[PDB]
């Protein structure tokens, strides 16, 4: 009876030195991400809409052009909603599908439904078009390094459909894609042929990005079982800052502060957290002032803050994977 599902408890990062940190800082391009990964997602894309289809095609195409050996799966399912039965499609992109362990980055790609109001359309720029584009830019920026994985540990990206309530949040109207995928992963043996371990036991850590892109985000350390990984984010931010590798950034206004949040925030990590998966929840508190308004748009995004977080996240992922 293997103790492999316990490895995540002892897993340590392989920390990058200054030279490698400068390399990662220089290897990501906020302007390329903006043009190639972000702008095509700044469209209406509530579940089942033509925009959902276009967003999903864009996400798959951007991953498909990369050199690393990504395996794309579309997880399509039905769920009851306030509007009756509807179809939803999660996007899962995985390196080394049979690898026992994966570090998982995720966000939601649907946008909240709103009827057009005075000709304005809701595009959820921070919620969560930016997180989607950050995951795509990370895949692009680290592509040569990720190609090398082609420690039975690899990387997986999940873009959830249906995170948003069709009305106002309720237990039955929200988290459609995550409630479904968590249940499916919980009931899927992993690695293939296993007798008693599931894909959820294989999830070393779920790093869920949400509501990113506004100025001065502050991310609290929500959970004690991922606190040491939150501390690594703080360390990475501090070192990139001291190396002069962040833009318009100060330690007094740092993003990862020493501070917990005891309350519960409803998001896509919930169905995973309640099945025992460790979560690093990269959602700011308080939420962007533009949250769920037509002003959550491109104009209100803070370019250098997103650039800075791309660097921190990319360093975190390489250190976790020992790349």
Binding site for Zn ion (CB under 5 A): 127
Nearest to 65 by CA among 9, 143, 2, 128: 143
Query: What letter does residue 159 receive in the DSSP assignment?
Result: E
Q: How far is the CB of 175 from Zn ion (least distance, A)?
A: 11
Least distance from Zn ion to the Cβ atom of residue 315, Å: 28
Q: How far is the CB of 93 from Zn ion (least distance, A)?
A: 22
CB of 193 to Zn ion, least distance (A): 39
Q: What whole-number distance in Å separates Cα of residue 43 and Cα of residue 79? A: 24
Q: Which is nearer to Zn ion, 127 or 173 (CB)?
A: 127
Minimum CB distance to Zn ion, residue 292 (Å): 6
Rank residues 127 and 137 by Cβ distance to Zn ion and give the closer one: 127
CB of 5 or CB of 131, closer to Zn ion: 131
Answer whether 238's CB lies under 8 Å from 254's CB.
yes
Measured between its terminal Cα atoms, the distance across the chain in Å is 30
Contact in structure between 201 and 186 (CB atoms under 8 Å)? no
Question: 125 or 309: whose CB is closer to Zn ion?
Answer: 125
Bridge partners (DSSP) of residue 30 are none
Q: How many whole angstroms separate alpha carbon 107 and alpha carbon 104?
A: 10
Please choose, from the candidates 21, 1, 93, the residue with its C-alpha nearest in 3D space to the C-alpha of residue 244.
Answer: 21
Nearer to Zn ion, 127 or 239 (CB): 127
Identity of the residue, 109 or 229, whose beta carbon is nearer to Zn ion in the bound complex: 109
Strands of 63-108 (E only): list them: 71-79, 86-94, 101-108
**Distance between CA 21 and CA 23 in Å, rounded?**
5
Output the smallest distance, CB 128 to Zn ion, in A.
Answer: 8
Closest residue to Zn ion, judged by C-beta, is: 127
Closer residue to Zn ion in complex, CB, 99/106: 106
Q: How far is the CB of 140 from Zn ion (least distance, A)?
A: 25
Residue 54's contacts (CB-CB under 8 Å, 6 or more residues apart) are: 40, 43, 45
d(Cα 114, Cα 49) in Å, to the nearest integer? Answer: 12
Please report how close the Cβ of residue 165 comes to Zn ion at its closest, in angstroms: 9
Check if the beta carbon of residue 174 is closer than 8 Å to that of residue 95.
no
Q: Which letter does DSSP use for residue 298 in this model?
A: S
Residue 269, CA distances (Å) to 178, 248, 323 in order: 7, 31, 26
Task: Pick the closer one to Zn ion by CB: 129 or 315.
Answer: 129
């Amino acid at each position: 009876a293997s103790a492999w599902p316990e490895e995540k408890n002892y897993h340590q990062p392989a920390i990058l030195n200054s030279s490698a940190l400068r390399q990662i800082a220089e290897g990501t391009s906020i302007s390329e991400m903006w043009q190639n990964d972000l702008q095509p997602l700044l469209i209406e894309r509530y579940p089942g809409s033509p925009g959902s289809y276009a967003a999903r095609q864009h996400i798959m195409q951007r991953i498909q052009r990369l050199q690393a050996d990504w395996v794309l799966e579309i997880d399509t399912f039905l769920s009851q909603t306030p509007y009756g039965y509807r179809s939803f499609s999660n996007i899962i992109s995985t390196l080394n599908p049979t690898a026992k362990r994966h570090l998982v980055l995720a966000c939601h790609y649907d946008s909240k439904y709103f009827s057009h109001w005075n000709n304005r359309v809701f595009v959820g720029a921070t919620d969560s078009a930016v997180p989607c584009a950050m995951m795509l830019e990370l895949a692009r920026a680290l592509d040569k390094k990720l190609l090398s994985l082609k420690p039975d540990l690899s990387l997986q990206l999940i873009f959830f459909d249906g995170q948003e309530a069709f009305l106002h949040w309720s237990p039955q109207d929200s988290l459609y894609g995550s409630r479904h995928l968590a249940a499916k992963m919980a009931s899927t043996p992993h690695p293939p042929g296993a007798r008693g371990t599931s894909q959820l036991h294989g999830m070393d850590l779920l790093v869920l990005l949400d509501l990113i892109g506004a100025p001065n985000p502050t991310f609290p350390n929500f959970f004690p079982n991922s606190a040491r990984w939150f501390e690594r984010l703080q360390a990475i931010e501090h070192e990139l800052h001291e190396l002069g590798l962040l833009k318009d950034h100060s330690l007094e206004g740092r993003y990862f502060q020493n501070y917990s949040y005891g309350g519960v925030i409803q998001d896509d990590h919930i169905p995973f957290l309640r099945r025992g998966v460790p979560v690093l929840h990269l959602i700011p508190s308080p939420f962007p002032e533009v949250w769920h308004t037509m002003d959550d748009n491109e104009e209100n995004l803070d370019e250098s803050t997103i650039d800075n977080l791309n660097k921190i996240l990319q360093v975190f992922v390489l250190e976790y994977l020992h790349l």
